[PDB]
Design a protein around this ligand. Structure first.
Ligand code: NA
Ligand code: NA
Ligand code: NA
Ligand code: NA
Lengths: 211, 211
């Protein structure tokens, strides 16, 4: 969840917002170790319920999100249903555990490609055109993250837009991402320079991956 | 419906067969002028019912078809349902009126392209990949006709097969078609030559479109 003023601004300037619970357990092995564990349900629920309680009157928020990169656990399913009872007015999405689980109203993969399948075991990233028509699948597909803009990037961006325009159920997505997470440091002459991971003696770090 | 031996041979050699009622009204304006007319329902029904009564014991027949290029009329709906009641063991298909009407269990377009849309009014031919994922569509897609093999043709055939293999609900199709409809004539030396439309003093005619 963001600074309160963000929603006010999006309400007034006009931006659709996906409001996302502060839950990410990416580093767990496997990724759902905590989110499938009933002992973590209370800490998890507070992160979801207190978000909804805070932001549910903002017109800009059109979609609720259960968080990011925490696999798919039973806690997700419980919290999905909690939102659906409490606030039927907005769809709930969540990418974890394969982007098309029972905890999401929207097929919301990250970095699924337009035409090329990436058949990873358990959590494949189908071509978004193919994903739509898998046997029994009926939901819309909006990419929660796509077109990783790291450095000299965004090659093949037009391919996504052509597909979005041709397919009714391909309804767009969210680029990753808006702003480089570089921080200012100063050299000996007091001159500013953009720093990334490692430049603060931080180790282990992931270098330029923050940009 | 074919010569009775054809089915016996498909039974024993192993080919899947689409058995098709002898109904085509292509030259009507509009195409369904007769098939939407209840006065022509008796004649159409005999063409459908007497086929089922003849061929329903052949294992090689796996799909019934209501006929060919006759638009979509109410008579098709009624006869679709007749077959569904009398023989539940086989799907019913029909391409008329846009290939996805209420008279077909199978989206069965003719010459629908792989990636390219052809948005004709009333009866569009969507890209087959797009067609599957149209809002609310669930049915399998098998082209009743594709890859028109007229003269030096079959350019782009590989494109179909790549897509058939990638998309579960793209379950293939039926090439148009098996054998040139040329006839033998004889020159003044008595040597045979391949003749087509117009070569018998037939007028008007559609020339080589029979091959
Ligand atoms: Na779209
Ligand atoms: Na990053
Ligand atoms: Na297929
Ligand atoms: Na022809």
């Amino acid at each position: 969840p963001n600074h309160p003023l963000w929603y006010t601004l999006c309400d007034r300037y006009g931006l659709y917002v996906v409001d996302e619970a502060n839950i990410e357990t990416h580093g767990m092995v496997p990724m759902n170790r905590l989110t499938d564990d009933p002992r973590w349900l209370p800490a998890m629920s507070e992160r979801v319920t207190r978000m909804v309680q805070r932001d549910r009157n903002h017109p800009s928020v059109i979609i609720w999100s259960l968080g990011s990169e925490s696999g798919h656990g039973a806690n997700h399913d419980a919290l999905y249903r909690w939102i659906k009872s409490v606030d039927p007015s907005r769809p709930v999405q969540y990418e974890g555990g394969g982007a098309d689980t029972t905890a999401t109203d929207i097929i919301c993969p990250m970095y699924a490609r337009v035409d090329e399948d990436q058949p990873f075991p358990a959590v494949p990233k189908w071509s978004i055109k193919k994903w739509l028509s898998l046997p029994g699948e009926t939901r819309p597909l909006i990419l929660c993250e796509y077109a990783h803009a790291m450095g000299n990037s965004l090659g093949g961006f037009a391919k996504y837009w052509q597909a979005f325009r041709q397919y009714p159920r391909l309804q767009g997505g969210f680029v990753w991402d808006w702003v480089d997470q570089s921080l200012i440091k100063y050299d000996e002459n007091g001159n500013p320079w953009s720093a990334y991971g490692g430049d603060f003696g931080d180790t282990p770090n992931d270098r330029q991956f923050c940009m």
